[PDB]
Amino acid sequence: AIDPALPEYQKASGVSGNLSSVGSDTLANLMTMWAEEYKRLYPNVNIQIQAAGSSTAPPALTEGTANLGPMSRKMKDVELQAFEQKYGYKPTAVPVAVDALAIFVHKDNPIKGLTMQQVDAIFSATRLCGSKQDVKTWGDLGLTGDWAKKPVQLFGRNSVSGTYGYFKEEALCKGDFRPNVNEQPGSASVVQSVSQSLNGIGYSGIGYKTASVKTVALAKKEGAAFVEDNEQNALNGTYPLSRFLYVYVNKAPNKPLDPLEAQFLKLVLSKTGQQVVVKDGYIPLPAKVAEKAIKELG
Ligand SMILES: [Pt+2]
């Protein structure tokens, strides 16, 4: 299930204090489960997690109120720069898992695949990926019979979601979402809304999949292959919305991390940590990714 070359976690000494995480909802369950494990190994640690969205991580790290900043996108240059203005160096992005950001439909929706131009036409007001068609009904996407006149009901994330920002950039070619997207407070609500809407569609991290929804395979263009969300396609990038999930930390350039943060990350980047990734339905890190991160952190 996980790369057999991932390291095993070993307990270290000198670990105590209060870890606070602020950021991604994509990573909410991962952070909770990792935290639970970390607390069991080190009962002197107290953990607090807030998971309102990736855009909340940079100011918390910059202001020093968070020790860990989970994000499902990289920081923007302007976010990196705000941190740097204060500290004199950039915050460090630790990869912790892989996502195949999913387009979810109801399990009984007969649609098999969408092109990225269709995805844009569904979700955007702007159609910058090049469709000429304002998609309003499932018939506009090729469905037939009673599906042809069914409206497409849209569900998505809010302004501070990293998933929202990544989807905007990659799936909408930097355009804007349609105003009739029903914004939800987190990924579980997106998937729940699609589960309760035969005619619904939403986007969220693959880990929030449930048996009531299915993911749609995605083609880069008409006449190109529809690529499924699976570990191989996310790890070679062929799945068009593959992304790493990150935890940002404040690592000063030639100075070790406080054990409180260091050991948490070491746990995440181990077999124990990556087993949690698999259990939550995300894609675990190749061993070489974990090794690179460990080295970058000291
Ligand atoms: Pt869990």
Alpha carbons within 13 A on the beta-carbon side of 7: 17
Residue 206, phi then psi, degrees to nearest 5? -65, -25
Distance between CA atoms of residues 93 and 185, nearest Å: 25
279 alpha carbon – ligand 1 mean position (Å):
7
CA–centroid distance, residue 277 to ligand 1 (Å): 9
Question: In angstroms, what is the span from residue 25 Cα to ligand 1's centroid?
Answer: 14
Resolution in angstroms comes to 1.5
Task: Return the bridge partners of 245, or none.
Answer: 97
Residues with CB under 5 A from ligand 1 (ion): 33
Alpha carbon of 267 to ligand 1 centroid (Å): 16
Question: How many angstroms separate the alpha carbon of residue 280 from the centre of ligand 1?
Answer: 6
Say how many Å lie between the CA of residue 122 and the centre of ligand 1: 32
Cα–Cα distance between 100 and 171 in angstroms, integer? 13
Residue 108 in tokens: 């009984």
- Residue 275 CA to ligand 1 center (angstroms) comes to 11
Distance 29 CA to ligand 1 centre (A): 6
b/e string for 224-233 if b means 16 or more Cβ within 10 A? eeebbbebeb
Place of tokens 């062929």: 238
**Cα 15 to Cα 89: distance, rounded to the nearest angstrom:** 26
Between CA 274 and CA 276 the distance in angstroms is: 5
- Domain positions in the chain are 1-99+244-298, 100-243
Domain 1-99+244-298 class in CATH: alpha beta
Cα 35 to averaged position of ligand 1 atoms, centre (Å): 11
Nearest to 271 by CA among 290, 252, 253: 290
Question: How far is ligand 1, taken at its centre, from the CA of residue 189, in Å?
Answer: 17
For the domain made up of 100-243, give the CATH fold: D-Maltodextrin-Binding Protein; domain 2 (3.40.190)
